[PDB]
Amino acid sequence: QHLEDTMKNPSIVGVLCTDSQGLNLGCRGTLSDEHAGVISVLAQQAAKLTSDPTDIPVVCLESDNGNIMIQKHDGITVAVHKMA
Amino acid sequence: DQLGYLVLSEGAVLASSGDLENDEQAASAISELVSTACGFRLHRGMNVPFKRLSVVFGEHTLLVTVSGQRVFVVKRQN
């Protein structure tokens, strides 16, 4: 998907995919298996804040040590660490 | 601009305005999320997880900062 492009992206220093089930579905760089659960939870929780099924909720931790962006897609959760 | 306001303390609700007022379900949902988020460590002994926490949707978007046991939330358009 765009997923491949995310993985190939040199502006992104970490990425992790997961499920509502919190399994590690593929990571890279600064994100690893340890983070699966939490990112999963985060995404699921944010999706409880909208009732519109067309929304793609996005959780964004802004930090001086780079930003973390978590999108809840249907069937998959993508987390991205940008050294911005 | 501002669609609503929420501020929590110790986990309980301290103040609320706009869309966020008289909405327990939202309050506790946001509290849950924030707590989870605060429990996020990139590396070992990596604090704080975030300076700013956002949750963006189609039209609405929540903006959260945390200071002590006090949590501040706004609802915004765009």
Numbering used by the authors:
A (entry chain A): 89 to 172
B (entry chain B): 14 to 91
Provide passages from the article that reported this PDB entry.
Due to the lack of a transmembrane domain or a lipid-modified motif, the Rag GTPases are tethered to the lysosome by a lysosome-anchored protein complex called the Ragulator complex consisting of p18/LAMTOR1, p14/LAMTOR2, MP1/LAMTOR3, C7orf59/LAMTOR4, and HBXIP/LAMTOR5. The Ragulator complex is responsible for the recruitment of the Rag GTPases and mTORC1 to the lysosome and thus plays an important role in mTORC1 signaling. We found that the lysosome-anchored p18 functions as a scaffold to recruit the MP1-p14 and C7orf59-HBXIP heterodimers to the lysosome and then to form the Ragulator complex. We also identified two binding sites in the Ragulator, namely the α1 helix of p18 and the α2 helices of MP1-p14, which interact directly with the C-terminal dimeric Roadblock domains but not the N-terminal GTPase domains of Rag GTPases, and found that the interactions of the Ragulator with the Rag GTPases are required for their cellular co-localization and are essential in the recruitment of the Rag GTPases to the lysosome.
HBXIP alone exists in a monomer-dimer equilibrium in solution and assumes a homodimer in crystal structure; however, the structural feature of C7orf59 remains unknown. Compared with the MP1-p14 and C7orf59-HBXIP heterodimers alone, formation of the Ragulator complex does not cause notable conformational changes of the two heterodimers, except that the N-terminal helix α1 (residues 1–11) of C7orf59 is disordered in the heterodimer alone but is well defined in the complex owing to its interaction with p18. The interactions between MP1-p14 and C7orf59-HBXIP are largely dictated by p18, but their interactions also play an important role in the stabilization of the Ragulator complex.
